[model samples]
Target: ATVKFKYKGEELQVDISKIKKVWRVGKMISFTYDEGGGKTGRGAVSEKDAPKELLQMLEKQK
Candidate 1:
């Protein structure tokens, strides 16, 4: 699946597989997934390793 995100007023449309991983961090829930703009390892990141905004997006993702 793909999600379109806006960062710094720049629009970035990326592809993300619907594989969310859950992690326990203190008393909070951390979601993880893989995101990329295309190409191997290019702009790819685990959801836990993602930025706060992206994480929020992931959390709100369906």
Candidate 2:
């Protein structure tokens, strides 16, 4: 599955299979995921506007 949303006027998308971990802290959601070839990424987004599907996906890997 893929998650897409806009934050501060920029659009964001993430793949569920590639996401390694997700953590929720207050109203912010932070996560680390694979970028292939040993590379990785860390992202932080506000939970106030994200869809509930994002939370479910995050929890499945938690």
Candidate 3:
């Protein structure tokens, strides 16, 4: 599934299958995921800005 939301003020669409790991620290949620072309990427977002369903998806990764 793909979720659309804002991170650092910019909107983005992320696919769950690409995520390698996810972690939450206080109000920040960080994720590491595949960016295709053999590259990897990481991003962080404030928990308040993240959708409930997306957070649930990350929890299943653990």
TM-score of 2: 0.59
> Which is better, 1 or 2, measured by TM-score?
2
lDDT of 2 at 1: 57
Clashing pairs in 1: 33-47
Please, what are the lDDT tens digits per residue for candidate 3 over residues 1-62? Answer: 67775666888887777776876677777788778656677777676666767767656766
What TM-score would each prediction reach against the true structure?
0.27, 0.59, 0.60
> Weakest 10 consecutive residues, lDDT, candidate 1?
37-46
Q: Which stretches of candidate 2 lie over 4 Å from their true place?
A: 5-12, 57-62
Which candidate model has the greater lDDT, 1 or 3? Answer: 3
| Cα misplacement distance, residue 52 of candidate 3 (Å) | 2.7
RMSD of each: 8.3, 3.9, 3.9
Off by over 4 Å in 3: 6-11, 58-62
Whole-model alpha-carbon lDDT for candidate 1: 0.48
